[PDB]
Design a protein around this ligand. Sequence first.
Ligand SMILES: Nc1ccn([C@H]2CC[C@@H](COP(=O)(O)OP(=O)(O)OP(=O)(O)O)O2)c(=O)n1
Ligand SMILES: [Mg+2]
Ligand code: NA
Length: 357
Amino acid sequence: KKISQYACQRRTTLNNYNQLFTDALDILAENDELRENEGSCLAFMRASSVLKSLPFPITSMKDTEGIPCLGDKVKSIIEGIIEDGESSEAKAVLNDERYKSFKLFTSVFGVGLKTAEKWFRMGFRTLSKIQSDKSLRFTQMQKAGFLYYEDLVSCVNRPEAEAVSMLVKEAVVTFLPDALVTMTGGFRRGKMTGHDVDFLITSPEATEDEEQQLLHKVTDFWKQQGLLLYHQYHRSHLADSAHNLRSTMDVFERSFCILKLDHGRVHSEKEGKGWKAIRVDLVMCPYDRRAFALLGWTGSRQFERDLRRYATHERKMMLDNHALYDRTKRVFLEAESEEEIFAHLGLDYIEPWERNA
Ligand SMILES: Nc1ccn([C@H]2CC[C@@H](COP(=O)(O)OP(=O)(O)OP(=O)(O)O)O2)c(=O)n1
Ligand SMILES: [Mg+2]
Ligand code: NA
């Protein structure tokens, strides 16, 4: 059984035997991202992903034999960890002022690479200096980011994700009683924590106007209930989906929210102000596209990249979050399940908890 270069042909659980190596590769990948060296970034992400799939810890360079996605640079990183138990390259990145600033500034919701670079070239290094600066101007998203900073850096746990799921279902069924609400993202893959809580909403009987209006009704409901702290709508691009017939362009309508989650709704083993701000991502898809949407929104991000790369390079197929197109047969392939999509691709089925690539 030769290890495939594709994450969609590997089983990746959360039982990682190479966390010393992958933690260092992840820092090195993030450094190339924040510095826009996309090629080097992709090589580090692919190397980290394949080590996450190994059923044993690397203890010598002989263990790397036959493993794909491990270049010369990655190999010297791995060598460095075998000898010392630490990466000199990743340590230098953690000590780098541009990396430290970019990591700290982008940890504010609403702050991307352009705003982070701008603050860094103005000589800013702390969030205290940014927030007290008289001349800086913040976007509405950045203001929410600063207001709810501590709650948002603190990640979401599974008990909080289930409390959000309850509010999502409760909101949705008010307008569409037959709607199916599925928790997607990291939590569907078995993650204990997440940066947000992802959801896919679909209805067997909703009309084009009903499905196109549901997300707007759900946020108005939360605004009326005093639970909406921030929101941003994302219009559907299903009529422009052919952009994916050549990362992916998002095709479904989405509502991104920041929700006020009272402690009393959370059923955990566990104060101050009895509520926490949570990032909630709500995706609405037409019923016949639900299998493609579920596969696309479950992730991981690397698993998605490899599913698409595999479809193109190995099967002359074009996969995106709403469909699968066969370039040879000149037809879209239908699927009512993720299992049917994997079968169409000629891939052994991978469970959501095995998609942690
Ligand atoms: N605009 C987007 C955002 C996300 N996704 C996919 C990629 C994986 C999945 C969930 O995205 P994230 O919430 O960012 O990731 P996650 O795997 O849930 O990890 P995290 O804990 O950071 O939320 O949806 C997508 O197709 N289009
Ligand atoms: Mg997520
Ligand atoms: Na950010």
